[PDB]
Design a protein around this ligand. Structure first.
Ligand SMILES: Cc1cc2nc3c(=O)[nH]c(=O)nc-3n(C[C@H](O)[C@H](O)[C@H](O)COP(=O)(O)OP(=O)(O)OC[C@H]3O[C@@H](n4cnc5c(N)ncnc54)[C@H](O)[C@@H]3O)c2cc1C
Ligand SMILES: Cc1cc2nc3c(=O)[nH]c(=O)nc-3n(C[C@H](O)[C@H](O)[C@H](O)COP(=O)(O)OP(=O)(O)OC[C@H]3O[C@@H](n4cnc5c(N)ncnc54)[C@H](O)[C@@H]3O)c2cc1C
Lengths: 656, 649
């Protein structure tokens, strides 16, 4: 009945974790250039709880911290702390054989935590509201009906190569089934749903007046539409993998059990009834993953509870209150392609589906659009070349394959029967299981990713040895530093606010040394010069740390050198105190030995280039200014009016 | 005139930090007994929005944490970290001669932080609304005109001995602060901002008209009306002390300076122009206390002289004031234990160690729980005497400290070794370092009194848990999942007393015998748990019994401790361990608490977080006697524990 037409820079299809992270990242570029139009749609109402996830891993939290979202999430989430392993003994009774750390010591300053997905979303929704000044909001219930891509306009910055036809649904079309169960349940969301049903349930019924069918001309489209992604199926992107018939059930409940480790993360392998994974949650809840075509109507809590009782034998297990529940089969799926012309992208469950044994979904799916987001943002504001969009798929698809590989094995070890004795070859070795879990915990933290050389990751021009624990292509790891301004001891990763800027981390080394200070001054003379990356890439009369943020971490105690002993304003910006940090001893903490943790020489230092994303992309010395120019030349687009050579007088000397 | 009459349990005059903290603590007793009527009024139309008090010290933050208000505050406040001391050369040039820590290492897990008073107020206002489920609201602008006290009714529980006559003020009769609420650029609004903005409109409680005069019959009145207190003046309590001729100015600004330590806390003694104290704040602001010889320009001119030769300009100005160096304190804090005073109303001093808001909230944090327990029929009225016994001596020590410190800060630095009129910079440094212990608020030691029992304690069983001092937090490992945490986070301030059971080496058969015997006491018909928890109420709801043992959690289970006495049914915030964990070494917390690792001890902590009794597992008679002098037995006691051990099938 109503036919409409409009244009937009980005269309995000799906407002789950992936889609919302995409919106949150894009919001920053929308605030810098308010003409940009970024829309995000969902086809579901908010009346049926639409979520299922609860775990946030180490690198997700470091990233959320850089988006200003971690402290609010951390004030409510639960740190499970320990993984207690339970398996049958001589007589087949389950007992605790071991305990391993839920997060690996030293891997990150943030530990994995768990929290209701709806609270995670709310926090991301508030941030989007703030960063976009309420301008970007989820539109629902809306659903794409057609997608037409003109591959001949793909490299044209003025074109709108993707035409999306959206249908405005009815409240009833947008409401998912609940299969007759009283308890709020996300068996709709569940992966037992079929993509057929996913499309069939939100379909314009028969007595059918689409309320409105909108023709949206888009520069870019991001498909964050889940497991059965319609965006993926319409691009023709196959998905390799096959679903087992191992079936598990999920209970979010306030338990009433004598199980000694009911409040700890646990793995329970029973002799013959299946496994359980306990995920202790906030506010007295505990999540239970209980091992059990399937008729979802008959899939009740009761069936799941009866099976959990068998697995817990001889400990007791009862539910005091049940908030939600689901079911899922064990299966792994991945696509080979994440992009169609670097115009239509898929992210999140749309690209990779797997079991929840290591709670990786929401994590990986937000990290996908955290990666894509800054690349799209720089492209959209005219700051970076379109070729950086190829790095999305280059970096994230290999990661999804490694994710599916890890889940493939971990889910099967988790779902198999434990070996009775050593001769029982077709049982699961509990020692192999422990080994897989410990090894899986490094991968599952999200902190071990190493991106292969690409347009925004330059290994070839790097002297890696100058910063040995700052491996190009890996996340720039936070380490404690002492802010020079007042002596505040802090995690340096707090300083890397994600807002589209690249960083140049200047490890000034032993700045009191006359020879080292000569190198530092020469580097700052480069920075101040007419054609440095600072002068070239920061728009005329804009702040010189507004595109490329130049931060100095030195090796001296702050009693031995002043901030004004560093070049001003190249390294010591006028009346600004978030630029000079020190690897030294402080009132409440010992010398953190951060240069050493970063693998950098304490006397000579190094220069490390970090992406907007927080991933190290270049490692050189203070003399490697040509490698810095070349790195930025292949990525950034020069503003129409450049800042040019630094013309301000040293503010620390100047009399007023 | 419209006239009205009503009754209330507590009337709080003054909605500054003191009053708000009183409302916040009383809110909990109101939630437990919703008939209680607690009101809080104020003569200013709106809350403060800028400047004024800005310092939060260690013990305040520990307490705020126990009230669920520290993390919100910490997410915005600034930790000044260092104090840089500057004094003149031989040629009279100011230079940095030293740096000392802003918070003393090891003194607390919280460091002093700074954040203006409007933010604090916002936060205690939101807490109040949440705990009291919006029932307790600041009524403003209203002002008392008369107070009549009937001392012959002081000990009658049913009486309303204090009659307050209140007047509803009009928008234009209330005096607004010059640096008021500032609308936020943009369309986006968080709730702080939204709350801030409605708070910024004049607005009598509903139906009330400016001019309306209300006669309020009160059981209790708390005057938190500030340095010029109308309540203290009406009570006739003399503000004893002297006001010097030293005058200082204050600037809350975004500075434009080449001073190297502009973002650090600093003390600057200039040769002949006076002193400066720099207090580096949140969001690029810096607070400057500038000694004068009025408007902001006069204060800037003087700061330029003191900073010579460094530059000093103001990029933006958020607030400003001037005051005189002076100290004043009352001898009494209470009239019949019916009308109390708290905060600046009892003690005023210079802001050199930003003690005002800190001490004032600690006053009503102390008074509050005592009033709360009396009002809910849980404690006897005699505990109210301990407010004044504890807090007035502290106010006297505060004025004594400020008396000396403000004078050292406002004097001209000694040129020579012979310059005796001048201030010795070495004496100054000593005073500051020694002042920092006091100013943390963590060294208070209350004298023996009804709620603090030193005589019946065996202090040696817990040597760093000195009766009368705050029960210091120490890292522990929650046994349920192995979470490493500060144990003080567990002492939620909500009116409960704690019994901290240091179970010691629980795997020892002899030690477990003592533990079980203690738990048999707890479960017995006449224990403090059975006597003081109402029939069918949770047995940790009045006296909260927490167990901290010395074993690793791989060596003993939670269900090896008596259930439900020490291991409550399906509840996992009771058993903690002094052990090694995944991310931290063994904290050595028993040793930090000065408690024997094998034998343990039993420490009783007040609702307030102050230790009040130290004994051993056999000292059950001392525990009974301690609680019998304080608590009132409910009409229907819980009696002996009758639940089966829930851990056994
Ligand atoms: C039981 C269970 C527990 C899990 N636990 C965890 C855990 O703790 N940690 C973790 O990281 N992961 C977990 N996962 C995985 C995680 O839930 C998903 O991987 C994650 O939600 C993927 O997010 P997404 O944004 O890509 O897609 P989804 O979360 O599926 O969201 C897609 C969104 O797009 C919408 N949509 C779909 N089709 C259309 C359309 N055609 N048009 C418009 N909108 C559309 C939706 O209605 C939906 O809001 C768990 C999964 C399950 C099954
Ligand atoms: C103008 C000013 C400037 C200050 N500057 C500083 C500074 O630079 N540094 C520093 O550390 N501290 C400063 N303080 C001191 C500090 O703010 C207090 O120590 C702290 O707020 C604790 O005080 P209080 O709660 O007891 O009283 P206050 O904070 O004074 O609050 C008293 C409240 O009661 C009200 N009131 C007063 N009379 C009546 C009445 N008759 N009826 C009803 N309500 C009434 C007021 O409107 C006020 O809201 C300043 C205080 C003032 C008032």
């Amino acid at each position: 009945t109503k036919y409409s037409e409009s244009y937009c820079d980005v269309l995000i299809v799906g407002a789950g974790p992936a889609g919302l992270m995409a919106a949150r990242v894009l919001s920053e570029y929308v605030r810098q250039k308010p003409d940009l139009k970024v829309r995000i749609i969902d086809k579901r109402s908010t009346k049926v709880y639409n979520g299922q996830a609860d775990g946030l891993q180490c690198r997700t939290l470091e990233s959320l911290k850089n988006l200003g979202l971690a402290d609010k999430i951390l004030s409510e989430a639960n740190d499970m702390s320990t993984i207690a392993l339970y398996n049958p003994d001589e007589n087949g009774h389950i007992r605790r054989t071991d305990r391993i750390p839920d997060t690996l010591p030293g891997i990150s300053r943030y530990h994995q935590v768990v929290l209701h997905q709806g609270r995670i979303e709310r926090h991301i929704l508030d941030s989007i509201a703030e960063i976009s000044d309420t301008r970007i909001k989820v539109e629902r219930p809306l659903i794409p009906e057609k997608m037409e891509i003109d591959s001949s306009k793909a490299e044209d910055p003025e074109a709108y190569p993707v035409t999306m036809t959206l249908r405005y649904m009815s409240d009833h079309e947008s409401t998912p089934l609940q299969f007759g169960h009283k308890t709020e349940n996300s068996l709709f969301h569940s992966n037992l749903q079929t993509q057929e049903e996913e499309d069939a349930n939100y379909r314009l019924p028969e007595g059918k007046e689409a309320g409105e069918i909108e023709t949206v001309h888009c520069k870019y489209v991001i498909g964050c539409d889940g497991g059965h992604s319609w965006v993926r199926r319409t691009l023709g992107f196959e998905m390799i993998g096959e679903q087992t018939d191992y079936i598990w059930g999920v209970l979010d409940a306030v338990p009433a059990s004598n199980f000694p480790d009911i409040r700890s993360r646990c793995a329970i392998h029973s002799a013959e009834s299946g496994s359980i994974m306990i995920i202790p949650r906030e506010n007295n809840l505990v999540r239970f993953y209980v091992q059990l075509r399937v008729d979802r109507t008959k899939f009740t809590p009761e069936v799941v509870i009866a099976n959990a009782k068998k697995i817990f034998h001889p400990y007791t297990f009862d539910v005091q209150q049940l908030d939600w529940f689901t079911a899922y089969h064990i299966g792994q799926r991945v696509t080979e392609k994440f992009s169609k012309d670097e115009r239509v992208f898929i992210a999140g469950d749309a690209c990779h589906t797997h079991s929840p044994k290591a709670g990786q979904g929401m994590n990986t799916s937000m990290m996908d659009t955290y990666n894509l987001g800054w690349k799209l943002g720089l492209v959209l504001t005219g700051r970076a070349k379109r070729d950086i969009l190829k790095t999305y798929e280059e970096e994230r698809h290999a990661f999804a394959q490694a994710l599916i590989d890890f889940d493939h094995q971990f889910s099967r070890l988790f779902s198999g029967r434990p070996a009775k004795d050593v001769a029982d070859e077709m049982g699961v070795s509990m020692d192999v299981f422990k080994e897989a879990f410990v090894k899986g915990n490094e991968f599952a933290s999200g902190t071990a990713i190493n991106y292969d050389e690409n347009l925004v990751t330059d290994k070839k021009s790097s002297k890696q040895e100058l910063a040995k624990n700052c491996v190009v292509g890996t996340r720039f790891k936070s380490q404690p530093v002492v802010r020079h301004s007042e002596g505040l001891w802090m995690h340096f990763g707090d300083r890397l606010v994600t807002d589209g800027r690249f960083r140049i981390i200047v490890f000034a080394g032993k700045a009191t040394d006359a020879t080292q200070m000569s190198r530092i001054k020469k580097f700052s003379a480069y920075l101040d010069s007419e054609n440095s990356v600072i002068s070239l890439y920061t728009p005329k009369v804009s702040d010189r740390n507004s595109r490329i943020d130049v931060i100095t971490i030195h090796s001296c105690h702050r009693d031995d050198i002043e901030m004004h002993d560093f070049p001003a304003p190249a390294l010591h910006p006028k009346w600004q105190y978030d630029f000079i940090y020190a690897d030294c001893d402080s009132w409440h903490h010992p010398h953190p030995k951060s240069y050493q943790a970063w693998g950098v020489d304490e006397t000579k230092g190094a220069v490390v280039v970090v992406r907007p994303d927080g991933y190290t992309s270049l490692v050189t010395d203070l003399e490697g200014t040509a490698e810095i120019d070349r790195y930025f030349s292949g990525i950034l687009v020069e503003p129409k009016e450049k800042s040019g050579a630094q013309t301000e007088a040293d503010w620390t000397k100047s009399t007023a």
